[PDB]
Design a protein around this nucleic acid. Structure first.
Ligand SMILES: [Zn+2]
Lengths: 276, 76, 94
DNA sequence: CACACACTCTCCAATTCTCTAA
DNA sequence: TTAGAGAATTGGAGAGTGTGTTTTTTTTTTTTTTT
């Protein structure tokens, strides 16, 4: 069985605070991140660089008026992968409508949206369907904390100190760290699939499959409600037109000759850059 | 050999009829289409051959099913 | 314990919404007829309606199997004959 | 090691069949 | 001969026994014949 443990993080309160930050932050146009999301909706930008200096300033500002925060900067430097999903979910909730005449000549994703919505609606009245990542047209990143020069950086802010490949111990796994070193071998760009868009020969229903495993198994089984109730046992066909791809590059960072202790050999660390 | 020539003509004719369904290009060309059938259905059937005629698309719809019935059957 | 049984042509399924009322409504406004055109095109257009009705009513079985099963049911099950007699009586009034 | 494949072991309800039905 | 009550059989999903991987010949020495 799986035991249970008690951890004082409270992801729900953190998500509420995250939504408040994305709505009620204005750097010294409206809110900065709402303006950024407006630019994203206009398809003029696809990179949400969530700065950590801004989150620190937001926490400091609300510290004087209620301390309505749980040290988010210290809560995502400890586990950043989950908070990428949290930020993406908060952005999808507060995504403004476009305020520009964007050409929709290539709207395959929008076409699938409306087509599947109409097919579902013609039977919903009886006269989530889409994976969250499929609809997203933006990549979310984190900008690490800058220099603090204050008591806040009391050995904290591990993303502020540029480490070396040797100092990346095993207990840093999952944290948001920064390394300093010389790139040695960057690979070519390859399209890494995030969600496949299988289409069935009959039953008309297309089923998506999110994948982050470096290797997956195709479904090839029309488990849709109509196909199962009719027992047609249809097979699935991939549709790269309706699939979602993200550019993937696999760099490799070494360490400078000044960071290597005497008598040792420089180490290396694989880097997976993807998105923009 | 006269009957040989006639049989070659007949088999050439049937082979010509056979190639009327095959695509001008390779199988992996990926010809995908949706038939706007009654009830605004968006059923997806593959094949660039179906893009030529709607009857070919309907036949590809018919033979896509893998289920078949039982046909009964029977010198000293 | 037991697999889900395969759906068969039940009597209730024969009277689906996309069934007898649909074909009776669209018979006079779906298929066009012209003797000038080749007979193969007319025959294919005629069979198109029944094929689509069968598929959107029963996508599991194929064409020939569906028609054979329907013919056997009509020859065996008398409820279909009773319904046909009722519609014939209704049409006789005109 | 274990997840996926190929396949022997095994099993009830829909499909066929012929005695008694109308 | 017809619409309908009885026997009789066997295919399609699933319990299960045993599989099959990952898995590698670079770079570095040492020899040997020609050069
Ligand atoms: Zn299917």
């Amino acid at each position: 069985a799986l035991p249970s443990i008690q951890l004082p993080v409270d992801y729900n309160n953190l998500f509420n605070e995250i939504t408040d930050f994305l709505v009620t932050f204005k750097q010294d146009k409206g809110p900065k991140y709402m303006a950024m999301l407006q630019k994203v909706a206009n398809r003029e930008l696809n990179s949400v660089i969530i700065d950590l200096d801004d989150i620190l300033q937001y926490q400091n500002e609300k510290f004087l008026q209620g301390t309505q925060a749980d040290d988010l900067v210290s809560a995502i430097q400890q586990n950043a992968n989950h908070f990428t999903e949290l930020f993406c979910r908060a952005i999808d909730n507060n995504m403004p409508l476009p305020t520009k005449e964007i050409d929709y000549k290539d709207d395959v994703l929008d076409v699938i949206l409306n087509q599947r919505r109409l097919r579902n609606e013609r039977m919903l009245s009886d006269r989530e369907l889409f994976p969250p990542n499929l609809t997203r047209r933006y990549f979310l990143y984190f900008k690490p904390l800058s220099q603090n020069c204050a008591r806040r950086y009391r050995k904290k802010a591990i993303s502020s100190k540029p480490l070396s490949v040797r100092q990346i111990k095993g207990d840093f796994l999952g944290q948001l760290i920064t390394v300093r070193g010389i790139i040695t071998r960057v690979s070519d760009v390859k399209p890494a699939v995030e969600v496949i868009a299988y289409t069935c020969d009959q039953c008309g229903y297309e089923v998506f499959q999110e994948v982050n495993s470096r290797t997956f198994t195709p479904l090839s089984e029309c488990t849709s409600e109509e196909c199962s109730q009719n027992q047609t046992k249809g097979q699935l066909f991939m549709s790269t037109r309706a699939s979602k791809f993200s550019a993937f590059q696999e760099c490799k960072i070494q360490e400078l000759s000044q960071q290597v202790p005497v008598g040792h050999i420089p180490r290396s660390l694989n880097i997976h850059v993807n998105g923009t | 050999g006269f009957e040989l020539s006639k049989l070659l003509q007949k088999e050439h004719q049937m082979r010509k009829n056979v190639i009327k369904h095959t695509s001008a290009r390779h199988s992996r060309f990926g010809g995908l289409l949706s038939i706007q059938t009654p009830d605004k259905t968006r059923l997806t059937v593959s094949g660039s051959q179906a893009l030529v005629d709607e009857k070919i698309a309907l036949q590809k719809l018919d033979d896509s099913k893998k289920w078949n019935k039982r046909i009964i059957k029977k010198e000293g | 314990r037991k697999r889900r049984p395969q759906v068969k042509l039940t009597a209730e399924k024969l009277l689906s919404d996309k069934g007898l009322p649909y074909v009776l409504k669209n018979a006079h406004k779906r298929i066009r007829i012209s003797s000038k055109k080749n007979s193969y095109d007319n025959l294919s257009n005629i069979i198109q309606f029944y094929q689509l009705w069968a598929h959107e009513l029963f996508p599991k079985a194929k064409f020939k199997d569906f028609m054979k099963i329907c013919q056997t049911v009509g020859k065996t099950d008398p409820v279909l004959r009773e319904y046909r007699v009722s519609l014939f009586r209704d049409e006789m009034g005109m």
